[PDB]
mmCIF file of C-alpha atoms and ligand atoms in Angstrom:
data_model
loop_
_atom_site.group_PDB
_atom_site.id
_atom_site.type_symbol
_atom_site.label_atom_id
_atom_site.label_comp_id
_atom_site.label_asym_id
_atom_site.label_seq_id
_atom_site.Cartn_x
_atom_site.Cartn_y
_atom_site.Cartn_z
ATOM 1 C CA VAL Z 1 -93.895 38.354 18.524
ATOM 2 C CA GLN Z 2 -91.914 40.554 21.024
ATOM 3 C CA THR Z 3 -91.175 44.099 19.753
ATOM 4 C CA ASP Z 4 -87.749 45.871 19.816
ATOM 5 C CA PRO Z 5 -87.700 47.564 22.410
ATOM 6 C CA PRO Z 6 -89.922 45.032 24.365
ATOM 7 C CA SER Z 7 -93.479 46.322 24.957
ATOM 8 C CA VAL Z 8 -95.694 43.169 24.478
ATOM 9 C CA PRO Z 9 -96.795 41.609 27.851
ATOM 10 C CA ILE Z 10 -95.565 38.002 28.414
ATOM 11 C CA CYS Z 11 -99.292 37.005 28.808
ATOM 12 C CA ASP Z 12 -99.979 38.045 25.143
ATOM 13 C CA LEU Z 13 -96.886 36.190 23.786
ATOM 14 C CA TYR Z 14 -98.232 32.881 25.203
ATOM 15 C CA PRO Z 15 -101.974 32.787 24.183
ATOM 16 C CA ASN Z 16 -102.449 29.264 25.696
ATOM 17 C CA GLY Z 17 -101.419 30.624 29.143
ATOM 18 C CA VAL Z 18 -98.581 28.070 29.388
ATOM 19 C CA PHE Z 19 -95.271 29.898 30.085
ATOM 20 C CA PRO Z 20 -91.767 28.444 29.278
ATOM 21 C CA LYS Z 21 -90.066 26.241 31.879
ATOM 22 C CA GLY Z 22 -86.626 27.248 33.204
ATOM 23 C CA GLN Z 23 -83.624 24.864 33.276
ATOM 24 C CA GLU Z 24 -84.740 21.458 34.678
ATOM 25 C CA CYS Z 25 -82.122 19.541 36.713
ATOM 26 C CA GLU Z 26 -81.994 16.179 38.492
ATOM 27 C CA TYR Z 27 -81.379 16.543 42.270
ATOM 28 C CA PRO Z 28 -77.764 15.966 43.532
ATOM 29 C CA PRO Z 29 -76.863 12.394 44.686
ATOM 30 C CA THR Z 30 -76.685 11.606 48.444
ATOM 31 C CA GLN Z 31 -73.472 11.038 50.530
ATOM 32 C CA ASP Z 32 -73.990 7.243 49.975
ATOM 33 C CA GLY Z 33 -74.098 7.862 46.182
ATOM 34 C CA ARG Z 34 -77.867 7.192 45.770
ATOM 35 C CA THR Z 35 -79.346 9.069 42.751
ATOM 36 C CA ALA Z 36 -82.489 11.260 42.978
ATOM 37 C CA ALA Z 37 -83.459 10.321 39.328
ATOM 38 C CA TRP Z 38 -86.496 8.253 40.680
ATOM 39 C CA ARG Z 39 -88.390 11.578 41.393
ATOM 40 C CA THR Z 40 -88.833 12.283 37.608
ATOM 41 C CA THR Z 41 -90.850 9.066 36.973
ATOM 42 C CA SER Z 42 -92.564 8.638 40.406
ATOM 43 C CA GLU Z 43 -96.370 8.837 39.902
ATOM 44 C CA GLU Z 44 -96.749 10.240 43.474
ATOM 45 C CA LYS Z 45 -94.135 12.993 42.826
ATOM 46 C CA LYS Z 46 -95.777 13.751 39.417
ATOM 47 C CA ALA Z 47 -99.213 14.031 41.160
ATOM 48 C CA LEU Z 48 -97.773 16.445 43.808
ATOM 49 C CA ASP Z 49 -96.017 18.430 41.021
ATOM 50 C CA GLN Z 50 -99.206 18.693 38.862
ATOM 51 C CA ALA Z 51 -101.170 19.881 41.970
ATOM 52 C CA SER Z 52 -98.885 23.014 42.062
ATOM 53 C CA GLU Z 53 -98.722 23.553 38.218
ATOM 54 C CA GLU Z 54 -100.601 26.898 38.523
ATOM 55 C CA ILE Z 55 -97.906 28.087 41.035
ATOM 56 C CA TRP Z 56 -94.972 27.024 38.768
ATOM 57 C CA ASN Z 57 -96.784 28.584 35.751
ATOM 58 C CA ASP Z 58 -96.927 31.986 37.635
ATOM 59 C CA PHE Z 59 -93.185 31.799 38.514
ATOM 60 C CA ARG Z 60 -92.491 30.926 34.808
ATOM 61 C CA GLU Z 61 -94.467 33.945 33.527
ATOM 62 C CA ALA Z 62 -92.547 36.218 36.009
ATOM 63 C CA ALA Z 63 -89.203 34.540 34.941
ATOM 64 C CA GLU Z 64 -89.898 35.115 31.172
ATOM 65 C CA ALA Z 65 -90.589 38.832 31.854
ATOM 66 C CA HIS Z 66 -87.312 38.910 33.871
ATOM 67 C CA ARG Z 67 -85.244 37.311 31.026
ATOM 68 C CA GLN Z 68 -86.659 39.716 28.396
ATOM 69 C CA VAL Z 69 -86.120 42.773 30.664
ATOM 70 C CA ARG Z 70 -82.490 41.830 31.454
ATOM 71 C CA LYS Z 71 -81.655 41.035 27.752
ATOM 72 C CA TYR Z 72 -83.072 44.563 26.983
ATOM 73 C CA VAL Z 73 -81.051 46.156 29.860
ATOM 74 C CA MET Z 74 -77.805 44.560 28.539
ATOM 75 C CA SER Z 75 -78.370 46.119 25.061
ATOM 76 C CA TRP Z 76 -78.380 49.764 26.334
ATOM 77 C CA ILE Z 77 -76.829 49.996 29.852
ATOM 78 C CA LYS Z 78 -73.865 52.384 29.372
ATOM 79 C CA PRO Z 79 -71.664 54.748 31.422
ATOM 80 C CA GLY Z 80 -72.945 58.343 31.151
ATOM 81 C CA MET Z 81 -76.508 57.344 32.053
ATOM 82 C CA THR Z 82 -77.842 58.516 35.431
ATOM 83 C CA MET Z 83 -78.763 55.712 37.879
ATOM 84 C CA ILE Z 84 -82.350 57.187 37.873
ATOM 85 C CA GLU Z 85 -82.581 56.872 34.013
ATOM 86 C CA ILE Z 86 -81.289 53.219 34.194
ATOM 87 C CA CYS Z 87 -83.847 52.278 36.904
ATOM 88 C CA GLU Z 88 -86.815 54.068 35.183
ATOM 89 C CA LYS Z 89 -86.023 52.565 31.730
ATOM 90 C CA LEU Z 90 -85.711 49.046 33.300
ATOM 91 C CA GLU Z 91 -88.888 49.462 35.436
ATOM 92 C CA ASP Z 92 -90.956 50.895 32.496
ATOM 93 C CA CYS Z 93 -90.128 47.704 30.496
ATOM 94 C CA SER Z 94 -90.717 45.418 33.495
ATOM 95 C CA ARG Z 95 -94.204 47.031 34.153
ATOM 96 C CA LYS Z 96 -95.170 46.518 30.471
ATOM 97 C CA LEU Z 97 -93.952 42.855 30.193
ATOM 98 C CA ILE Z 98 -95.348 41.691 33.580
ATOM 99 C CA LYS Z 99 -98.703 43.488 32.676
ATOM 100 C CA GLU Z 100 -98.650 45.341 36.041
ATOM 101 C CA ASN Z 101 -102.057 44.949 37.739
ATOM 102 C CA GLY Z 102 -102.122 46.095 41.398
ATOM 103 C CA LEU Z 103 -101.154 43.244 43.780
ATOM 104 C CA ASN Z 104 -101.930 40.525 41.143
ATOM 105 C CA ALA Z 105 -98.885 41.204 38.829
ATOM 106 C CA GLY Z 106 -95.977 43.612 39.044
ATOM 107 C CA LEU Z 107 -92.593 44.519 40.486
ATOM 108 C CA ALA Z 108 -91.550 42.403 43.484
ATOM 109 C CA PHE Z 109 -89.013 44.937 44.838
ATOM 110 C CA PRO Z 110 -87.139 48.103 43.708
ATOM 111 C CA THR Z 111 -84.386 47.870 41.056
ATOM 112 C CA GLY Z 112 -81.009 47.617 42.809
ATOM 113 C CA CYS Z 113 -78.148 49.210 40.891
ATOM 114 C CA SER Z 114 -75.541 49.124 43.663
ATOM 115 C CA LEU Z 115 -72.090 50.345 42.693
ATOM 116 C CA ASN Z 116 -68.529 49.351 43.564
ATOM 117 C CA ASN Z 117 -68.137 48.833 47.322
ATOM 118 C CA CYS Z 118 -71.921 48.923 47.836
ATOM 119 C CA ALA Z 119 -73.058 45.310 47.450
ATOM 120 C CA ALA Z 120 -76.818 45.711 47.665
ATOM 121 C CA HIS Z 121 -79.969 47.717 48.286
ATOM 122 C CA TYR Z 122 -79.051 50.900 46.524
ATOM 123 C CA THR Z 123 -81.589 52.538 44.268
ATOM 124 C CA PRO Z 124 -81.571 56.328 43.627
ATOM 125 C CA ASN Z 125 -84.077 58.507 45.567
ATOM 126 C CA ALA Z 126 -85.458 61.679 43.796
ATOM 127 C CA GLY Z 127 -82.707 64.230 43.042
ATOM 128 C CA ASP Z 128 -79.878 61.620 43.022
ATOM 129 C CA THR Z 129 -77.433 62.905 40.344
ATOM 130 C CA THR Z 130 -75.228 59.722 40.353
ATOM 131 C CA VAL Z 131 -73.992 58.804 36.865
ATOM 132 C CA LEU Z 132 -72.758 55.285 35.909
ATOM 133 C CA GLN Z 133 -68.957 55.386 35.225
ATOM 134 C CA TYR Z 134 -66.759 53.314 32.889
ATOM 135 C CA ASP Z 135 -64.845 51.822 35.899
ATOM 136 C CA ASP Z 136 -68.024 51.045 37.871
ATOM 137 C CA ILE Z 137 -69.121 47.574 38.954
ATOM 138 C CA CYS Z 138 -72.956 47.722 38.920
ATOM 139 C CA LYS Z 139 -75.222 45.040 40.442
ATOM 140 C CA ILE Z 140 -78.578 44.997 38.614
ATOM 141 C CA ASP Z 141 -81.004 43.263 41.001
ATOM 142 C CA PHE Z 142 -84.721 43.371 40.151
ATOM 143 C CA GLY Z 143 -87.804 41.304 40.718
ATOM 144 C CA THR Z 144 -91.068 40.450 39.027
ATOM 145 C CA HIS Z 145 -94.101 38.600 40.353
ATOM 146 C CA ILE Z 146 -97.363 36.984 39.271
ATOM 147 C CA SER Z 147 -99.830 36.418 42.190
ATOM 148 C CA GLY Z 148 -96.954 37.003 44.640
ATOM 149 C CA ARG Z 149 -94.798 34.258 42.973
ATOM 150 C CA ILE Z 150 -91.512 36.182 43.070
ATOM 151 C CA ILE Z 151 -88.523 36.001 40.715
ATOM 152 C CA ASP Z 152 -85.426 37.300 42.567
ATOM 153 C CA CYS Z 153 -82.669 37.428 39.926
ATOM 154 C CA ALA Z 154 -79.485 39.559 39.634
ATOM 155 C CA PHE Z 155 -76.330 40.022 37.551
ATOM 156 C CA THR Z 156 -73.278 42.306 37.566
ATOM 157 C CA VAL Z 157 -72.589 44.872 34.829
ATOM 158 C CA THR Z 158 -69.015 46.097 34.039
ATOM 159 C CA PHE Z 159 -67.337 47.997 31.119
ATOM 160 C CA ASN Z 160 -63.688 47.574 32.083
ATOM 161 C CA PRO Z 161 -62.302 44.015 31.472
ATOM 162 C CA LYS Z 162 -60.069 44.367 34.636
ATOM 163 C CA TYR Z 163 -63.065 42.946 36.671
ATOM 164 C CA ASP Z 164 -63.572 39.867 34.391
ATOM 165 C CA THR Z 165 -61.999 37.317 36.810
ATOM 166 C CA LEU Z 166 -63.884 38.812 39.856
ATOM 167 C CA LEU Z 167 -67.191 38.354 37.893
ATOM 168 C CA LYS Z 168 -66.172 34.805 36.855
ATOM 169 C CA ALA Z 169 -65.450 33.864 40.556
ATOM 170 C CA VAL Z 170 -68.940 35.031 41.656
ATOM 171 C CA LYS Z 171 -70.761 33.399 38.659
ATOM 172 C CA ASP Z 172 -68.949 30.090 39.421
ATOM 173 C CA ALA Z 173 -69.880 30.288 43.183
ATOM 174 C CA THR Z 174 -73.572 31.034 42.268
ATOM 175 C CA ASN Z 175 -73.663 28.108 39.725
ATOM 176 C CA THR Z 176 -72.092 25.858 42.445
ATOM 177 C CA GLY Z 177 -74.855 26.869 44.895
ATOM 178 C CA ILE Z 178 -77.536 26.143 42.255
ATOM 179 C CA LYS Z 179 -75.901 22.699 41.585
ATOM 180 C CA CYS Z 180 -75.568 21.788 45.322
ATOM 181 C CA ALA Z 181 -79.165 22.855 46.256
ATOM 182 C CA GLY Z 182 -81.849 20.139 46.506
ATOM 183 C CA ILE Z 183 -84.608 18.512 48.604
ATOM 184 C CA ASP Z 184 -83.219 17.313 52.027
ATOM 185 C CA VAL Z 185 -79.823 19.006 51.249
ATOM 186 C CA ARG Z 186 -78.409 20.978 54.218
ATOM 187 C CA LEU Z 187 -78.259 24.804 53.820
ATOM 188 C CA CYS Z 188 -74.793 24.772 55.549
ATOM 189 C CA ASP Z 189 -73.548 22.299 52.859
ATOM 190 C CA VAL Z 190 -74.633 24.640 49.989
ATOM 191 C CA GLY Z 191 -72.805 27.461 51.864
ATOM 192 C CA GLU Z 192 -69.512 25.569 52.294
ATOM 193 C CA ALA Z 193 -69.538 24.564 48.560
ATOM 194 C CA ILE Z 194 -70.118 28.233 47.487
ATOM 195 C CA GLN Z 195 -67.193 29.437 49.718
ATOM 196 C CA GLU Z 196 -64.714 26.776 48.484
ATOM 197 C CA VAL Z 197 -65.339 27.813 44.831
ATOM 198 C CA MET Z 198 -65.232 31.621 45.357
ATOM 199 C CA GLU Z 199 -62.034 31.525 47.453
ATOM 200 C CA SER Z 200 -60.225 29.407 44.792
ATOM 201 C CA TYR Z 201 -60.031 32.634 42.719
ATOM 202 C CA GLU Z 202 -57.302 35.252 42.845
ATOM 203 C CA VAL Z 203 -57.693 38.549 40.952
ATOM 204 C CA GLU Z 204 -55.461 41.496 40.012
ATOM 205 C CA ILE Z 205 -57.025 44.978 39.799
ATOM 206 C CA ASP Z 206 -54.750 48.023 39.129
ATOM 207 C CA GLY Z 207 -51.589 46.186 40.317
ATOM 208 C CA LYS Z 208 -53.177 44.914 43.549
ATOM 209 C CA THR Z 209 -53.876 41.179 44.080
ATOM 210 C CA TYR Z 210 -56.798 39.778 46.061
ATOM 211 C CA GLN Z 211 -58.349 36.447 46.975
ATOM 212 C CA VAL Z 212 -62.124 36.753 46.193
ATOM 213 C CA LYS Z 213 -64.026 36.746 49.523
ATOM 214 C CA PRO Z 214 -67.737 35.777 49.820
ATOM 215 C CA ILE Z 215 -69.714 38.491 51.700
ATOM 216 C CA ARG Z 216 -70.347 36.527 54.948
ATOM 217 C CA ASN Z 217 -73.491 38.525 55.989
ATOM 218 C CA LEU Z 218 -75.131 38.448 52.503
ATOM 219 C CA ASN Z 219 -76.936 35.160 51.775
ATOM 220 C CA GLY Z 220 -79.417 33.202 49.634
ATOM 221 C CA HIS Z 221 -82.926 32.579 51.040
ATOM 222 C CA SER Z 222 -86.306 30.838 50.835
ATOM 223 C CA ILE Z 223 -89.099 32.733 48.983
ATOM 224 C CA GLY Z 224 -92.743 32.807 50.159
ATOM 225 C CA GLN Z 225 -95.873 34.197 48.483
ATOM 226 C CA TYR Z 226 -95.560 38.055 48.641
ATOM 227 C CA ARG Z 227 -92.517 37.255 50.891
ATOM 228 C CA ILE Z 228 -89.022 37.936 49.378
ATOM 229 C CA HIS Z 229 -87.332 36.313 52.450
ATOM 230 C CA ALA Z 230 -89.410 33.411 53.874
ATOM 231 C CA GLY Z 231 -87.095 32.718 56.878
ATOM 232 C CA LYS Z 232 -84.591 30.110 55.647
ATOM 233 C CA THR Z 233 -81.047 31.369 54.918
ATOM 234 C CA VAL Z 234 -78.512 29.846 52.477
ATOM 235 C CA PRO Z 235 -75.011 30.905 53.777
ATOM 236 C CA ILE Z 236 -72.126 31.698 51.364
ATOM 237 C CA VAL Z 237 -69.310 30.982 53.957
ATOM 238 C CA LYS Z 238 -68.467 27.869 56.145
ATOM 239 C CA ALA Z 239 -77.627 22.320 59.668
ATOM 240 C CA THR Z 240 -81.253 23.141 58.563
ATOM 241 C CA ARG Z 241 -82.336 21.352 55.329
ATOM 242 C CA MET Z 242 -84.158 22.430 52.131
ATOM 243 C CA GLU Z 243 -87.694 20.999 51.739
ATOM 244 C CA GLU Z 244 -89.925 19.794 48.836
ATOM 245 C CA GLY Z 245 -92.088 22.524 47.242
ATOM 246 C CA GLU Z 246 -89.835 25.340 48.564
ATOM 247 C CA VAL Z 247 -88.557 28.198 46.357
ATOM 248 C CA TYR Z 248 -85.044 29.650 46.866
ATOM 249 C CA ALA Z 249 -83.093 32.677 45.724
ATOM 250 C CA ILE Z 250 -79.544 31.311 45.255
ATOM 251 C CA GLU Z 251 -77.301 34.371 45.413
ATOM 252 C CA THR Z 252 -73.626 34.898 46.058
ATOM 253 C CA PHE Z 253 -71.565 38.031 46.575
ATOM 254 C CA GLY Z 254 -67.799 38.322 46.047
ATOM 255 C CA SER Z 255 -65.661 41.156 47.403
ATOM 256 C CA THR Z 256 -62.104 42.516 47.250
ATOM 257 C CA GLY Z 257 -62.761 44.137 50.689
ATOM 258 C CA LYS Z 258 -63.415 42.623 54.134
ATOM 259 C CA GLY Z 259 -66.177 40.269 52.902
ATOM 260 C CA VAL Z 260 -68.664 41.926 55.317
ATOM 261 C CA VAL Z 261 -71.265 44.673 54.677
ATOM 262 C CA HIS Z 262 -72.606 47.444 56.919
ATOM 263 C CA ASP Z 263 -75.542 49.828 56.489
ATOM 264 C CA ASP Z 264 -74.456 53.006 54.714
ATOM 265 C CA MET Z 265 -75.758 56.002 52.692
ATOM 266 C CA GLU Z 266 -79.317 57.288 52.327
ATOM 267 C CA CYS Z 267 -82.026 54.627 52.625
ATOM 268 C CA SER Z 268 -84.224 53.957 49.590
ATOM 269 C CA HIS Z 269 -85.641 50.456 50.222
ATOM 270 C CA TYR Z 270 -88.505 49.764 52.627
ATOM 271 C CA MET Z 271 -90.794 46.818 53.316
ATOM 272 C CA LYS Z 272 -93.651 46.083 55.703
ATOM 273 C CA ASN Z 273 -92.846 43.608 58.469
ATOM 274 C CA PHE Z 274 -94.566 40.358 57.425
ATOM 275 C CA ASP Z 275 -95.234 39.326 61.102
ATOM 276 C CA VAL Z 276 -96.952 42.604 62.030
ATOM 277 C CA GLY Z 277 -100.750 42.374 61.846
ATOM 278 C CA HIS Z 278 -103.381 45.154 61.872
ATOM 279 C CA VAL Z 279 -102.273 48.380 63.619
ATOM 280 C CA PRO Z 280 -104.918 51.181 63.952
ATOM 281 C CA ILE Z 281 -103.367 54.590 63.097
ATOM 282 C CA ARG Z 282 -104.966 57.969 63.845
ATOM 283 C CA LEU Z 283 -101.983 60.239 62.790
ATOM 284 C CA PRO Z 284 -103.400 61.393 59.409
ATOM 285 C CA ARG Z 285 -100.209 61.510 57.288
ATOM 286 C CA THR Z 286 -98.892 58.233 58.831
ATOM 287 C CA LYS Z 287 -102.386 56.613 58.383
ATOM 288 C CA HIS Z 288 -102.516 57.750 54.709
ATOM 289 C CA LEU Z 289 -99.025 56.444 53.899
ATOM 290 C CA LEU Z 290 -99.740 53.024 55.466
ATOM 291 C CA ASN Z 291 -103.008 52.770 53.385
ATOM 292 C CA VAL Z 292 -100.974 53.666 50.224
ATOM 293 C CA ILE Z 293 -98.435 50.892 51.164
ATOM 294 C CA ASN Z 294 -101.177 48.313 51.922
ATOM 295 C CA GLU Z 295 -103.010 49.008 48.627
ATOM 296 C CA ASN Z 296 -99.961 49.178 46.289
ATOM 297 C CA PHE Z 297 -97.308 46.919 47.842
ATOM 298 C CA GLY Z 298 -98.791 44.907 50.714
ATOM 299 C CA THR Z 299 -95.778 42.865 52.028
ATOM 300 C CA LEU Z 300 -93.646 43.475 48.871
ATOM 301 C CA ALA Z 301 -90.734 45.891 49.113
ATOM 302 C CA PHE Z 302 -90.932 49.448 47.713
ATOM 303 C CA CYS Z 303 -88.757 52.573 47.369
ATOM 304 C CA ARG Z 304 -89.214 56.337 47.785
ATOM 305 C CA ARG Z 305 -89.189 56.799 43.941
ATOM 306 C CA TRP Z 306 -92.323 54.544 43.773
ATOM 307 C CA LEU Z 307 -94.073 56.707 46.384
ATOM 308 C CA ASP Z 308 -93.185 59.815 44.278
ATOM 309 C CA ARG Z 309 -94.638 58.029 41.161
ATOM 310 C CA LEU Z 310 -97.879 57.330 43.117
ATOM 311 C CA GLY Z 311 -98.217 61.152 43.547
ATOM 312 C CA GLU Z 312 -97.182 61.128 47.222
ATOM 313 C CA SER Z 313 -95.198 64.038 48.760
ATOM 314 C CA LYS Z 314 -94.024 65.195 52.269
ATOM 315 C CA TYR Z 315 -94.227 61.509 53.406
ATOM 316 C CA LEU Z 316 -90.692 61.195 54.953
ATOM 317 C CA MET Z 317 -91.855 61.859 58.553
ATOM 318 C CA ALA Z 318 -94.865 59.474 58.017
ATOM 319 C CA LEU Z 319 -92.407 56.815 56.653
ATOM 320 C CA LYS Z 320 -90.047 57.325 59.655
ATOM 321 C CA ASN Z 321 -93.135 56.932 61.963
ATOM 322 C CA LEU Z 322 -93.957 53.573 60.285
ATOM 323 C CA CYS Z 323 -90.337 52.441 60.769
ATOM 324 C CA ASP Z 324 -90.276 53.540 64.487
ATOM 325 C CA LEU Z 325 -93.636 51.738 65.023
ATOM 326 C CA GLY Z 326 -92.093 48.481 63.620
ATOM 327 C CA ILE Z 327 -94.802 48.269 60.881
ATOM 328 C CA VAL Z 328 -92.252 49.044 58.087
ATOM 329 C CA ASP Z 329 -88.550 48.085 58.091
ATOM 330 C CA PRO Z 330 -85.862 50.190 56.297
ATOM 331 C CA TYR Z 331 -83.341 48.269 54.094
ATOM 332 C CA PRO Z 332 -80.473 50.743 53.644
ATOM 333 C CA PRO Z 333 -77.567 50.233 51.164
ATOM 334 C CA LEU Z 334 -75.108 47.508 52.291
ATOM 335 C CA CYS Z 335 -71.452 48.401 51.734
ATOM 336 C CA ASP Z 336 -68.052 46.799 52.159
ATOM 337 C CA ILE Z 337 -64.965 49.065 52.897
ATOM 338 C CA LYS Z 338 -64.272 52.141 50.712
ATOM 339 C CA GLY Z 339 -62.160 51.239 47.648
ATOM 340 C CA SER Z 340 -63.386 47.604 47.508
ATOM 341 C CA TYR Z 341 -65.223 45.935 44.567
ATOM 342 C CA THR Z 342 -68.264 43.733 44.953
ATOM 343 C CA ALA Z 343 -70.047 41.470 42.412
ATOM 344 C CA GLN Z 344 -73.305 39.456 42.555
ATOM 345 C CA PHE Z 345 -75.124 36.750 40.584
ATOM 346 C CA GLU Z 346 -78.551 35.423 41.583
ATOM 347 C CA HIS Z 347 -81.173 32.949 40.301
ATOM 348 C CA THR Z 348 -84.565 31.759 41.607
ATOM 349 C CA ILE Z 349 -84.976 27.972 41.924
ATOM 350 C CA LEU Z 350 -88.124 25.822 42.426
ATOM 351 C CA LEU Z 351 -87.698 22.637 44.503
ATOM 352 C CA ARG Z 352 -90.423 20.783 42.560
ATOM 353 C CA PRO Z 353 -91.392 17.245 43.742
ATOM 354 C CA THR Z 354 -90.032 15.807 40.405
ATOM 355 C CA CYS Z 355 -86.976 17.973 39.589
ATOM 356 C CA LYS Z 356 -85.056 21.149 40.512
ATOM 357 C CA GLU Z 357 -86.019 24.015 38.148
ATOM 358 C CA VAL Z 358 -83.727 27.103 37.764
ATOM 359 C CA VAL Z 359 -86.899 28.943 36.723
ATOM 360 C CA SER Z 360 -85.048 32.281 36.104
ATOM 361 C CA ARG Z 361 -82.192 30.689 33.948
ATOM 362 C CA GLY Z 362 -81.348 32.695 30.750
HETATM 363 C C1 HZE B 1 -80.938 42.798 54.319
HETATM 364 C C2 HZE B 1 -80.928 41.564 53.516
HETATM 365 C C3 HZE B 1 -79.857 41.560 52.486
HETATM 366 O O1 HZE B 1 -82.158 41.504 52.809
HETATM 367 C C4 HZE B 1 -83.299 41.083 53.420
HETATM 368 C C5 HZE B 1 -83.332 40.690 54.741
HETATM 369 C C6 HZE B 1 -84.527 40.302 55.338
HETATM 370 N N1 HZE B 1 -84.547 39.808 56.625
HETATM 371 C C7 HZE B 1 -85.825 39.668 57.319
HETATM 372 C C8 HZE B 1 -85.691 38.696 58.460
HETATM 373 N N2 HZE B 1 -84.685 39.159 59.368
HETATM 374 C C9 HZE B 1 -83.425 39.222 58.708
HETATM 375 C C10 HZE B 1 -83.486 40.185 57.552
HETATM 376 C C11 HZE B 1 -85.685 40.344 54.578
HETATM 377 C C12 HZE B 1 -85.647 40.716 53.250
HETATM 378 C C13 HZE B 1 -84.456 41.092 52.639
HETATM 379 C C14 HZE B 1 -84.462 41.542 51.206
HETATM 380 C C15 HZE B 1 -83.941 40.906 50.096
HETATM 381 C C16 HZE B 1 -83.197 39.657 49.919
HETATM 382 N N3 HZE B 1 -82.968 38.944 51.003
HETATM 383 O O2 HZE B 1 -82.815 39.327 48.831
HETATM 384 N N4 HZE B 1 -84.183 41.663 48.968
HETATM 385 C C17 HZE B 1 -84.866 42.804 49.319
HETATM 386 C C18 HZE B 1 -85.331 43.852 48.541
HETATM 387 C C19 HZE B 1 -85.976 44.879 49.181
HETATM 388 F F1 HZE B 1 -86.393 45.931 48.471
HETATM 389 C C20 HZE B 1 -86.171 44.863 50.541
HETATM 390 F F2 HZE B 1 -86.808 45.878 51.126
HETATM 391 C C21 HZE B 1 -85.724 43.828 51.310
HETATM 392 C C22 HZE B 1 -85.057 42.778 50.710
HETATM 393 MN MN1 MN B 2 -81.999 39.959 44.529
HETATM 394 MN MN1 MN B 3 -82.312 37.722 47.113
#
């Protein structure tokens, strides 16, 4: 049985090695009104689904770790805590439950804890004294993986009820996206549906009214093995189609600002360019850092805190060299206008030959 606080790896909770399935859904009907129900009983679709059972089983193990971590996070996340303490407590639990084992099992990307106007990609670097406030709107975005089968799942934390309708707008837009997604469904269609739902909401925060705006340059995406973004984008504002066997992160962002984000603040997130092959490096500090990245993260994203934890120091020039060489890409915090409020909800979905599985669903 799982301990309180959670410390038992998901692997040990399921001795048979069969991890729980997420929410299973029938695919949406076509424009003509033809149902996709036939996929569930098709012997050909069942054969194709069984052939990838090991892959879905890995996503399910990573999803169960994610559910247990986020249930744990919700029980203690409070204003007064430093952003570092929140991230380290969350990551310590995540490492234990995923049974972190080099590139075979672990953390898919750093824990995002972006606040207020900053929509995404903010994690504290060493020495960050930021403390979570009662009026903050915090986006907890973390990932787990088994054999590079990534769970990309996020939720928004608040303490003040004044943001309740903003959170509801974004949860409804995310659930709409999940519902509209399916094999042969256009990505532009999922995007238009998300926008229509989010914009139907009006909110009042400290005597000011706003229509909830989707963040036009933040989007959902396909997921590849050891690849957080596999090249297909799911817009969240108003003709490429989703394909069978694909995995998607369905995420939406709502804002009281412009509904557009720009790079801002100190960068904490970094990730090797997936398309860049072998690059010989002679520069000793740059060479060492790339070897550290290749061994510990490969093509998965990382943060400066994780380099500090690995015992690395005086690596900032080496890291900048890797960025300038195009081997590593920086992913700085993405912010809307000062004074604005942003919220996010995200799930990982499997486009299985038989059904659509919201593998990360709570
Ligand atoms: C800027 C955007 C929000 O995130 C991305 C854009 C890309 N793109 C490449 C192809 N060219 C366009 C950009 C790749 C990956 C991401 C990305 C995502 C995500 N999409 O959820 N989560 C992350 C976490 C990380 F720690 C990280 F380092 C990167 C990411
Ligand atoms: Mn995410
Ligand atoms: Mn994502």
